[PDB]
Design a protein around this ligand. Sequence first.
Ligand code: MET
Ligand SMILES: [Cl-]
Length: 240
Amino acid sequence: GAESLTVAATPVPHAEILNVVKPLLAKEGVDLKIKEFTDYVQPNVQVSEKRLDANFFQHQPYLDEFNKAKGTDLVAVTGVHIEPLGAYSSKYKKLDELPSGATVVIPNDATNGGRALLLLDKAGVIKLKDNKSITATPKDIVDNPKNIKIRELEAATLPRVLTQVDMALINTNYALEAKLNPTKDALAIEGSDSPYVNILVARPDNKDSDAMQKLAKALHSAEIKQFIQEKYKGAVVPAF
Ligand code: MET
Ligand SMILES: [Cl-]
């Protein structure tokens, strides 16, 4: 009979990708059971608490910081895709239009906050210190001529505050659920050669299990690459 494999995922793109791989896995004796979560904490907690076998929602910087903060030992299995992060505005059409004292909201977790600040640096809105890392904070800003006010709120909440700020830097999974189009709507956007490949994550006990390996291989398949390309039209970039 089939091997059970339970995977927590954010709904878009992750759970969509998993729904498309699920039949391929069934044909290799693996019964993939997908559980959707809307947040960036519970998928890890569920795996670490031995409730689910794996998850698919985060990048490696986030994982490493999560294990540090929580004292857990979740491990990456394979990389799947990149979601270049965009800056969105309901009020302005290009960065040059941002007013003095503009409110710019970014995620309040260490890695996605740092990532957002790095995009602001790349786009020339602010400048970060020369020795900055990818966990930069607003304290690391060395130039802010427009006196931008950097606001920090939980990642999932940013689409809901978009109309109440001048600009928001929104994780693509959340942007796509909100019907934002990163390639058309973004005022600035990351490149895809970045630290932020989204990874399948599991535990030491199952990373090298037969079922886990079959899932990992399916997630590098030509078929999944095609799905990602046609479905997300460049908003989600295959990492293989
Ligand atoms: C929980 S780390 C952020 C994950 C999100 N899908 C991104 O790539 O931006
Ligand atoms: Cl753990």
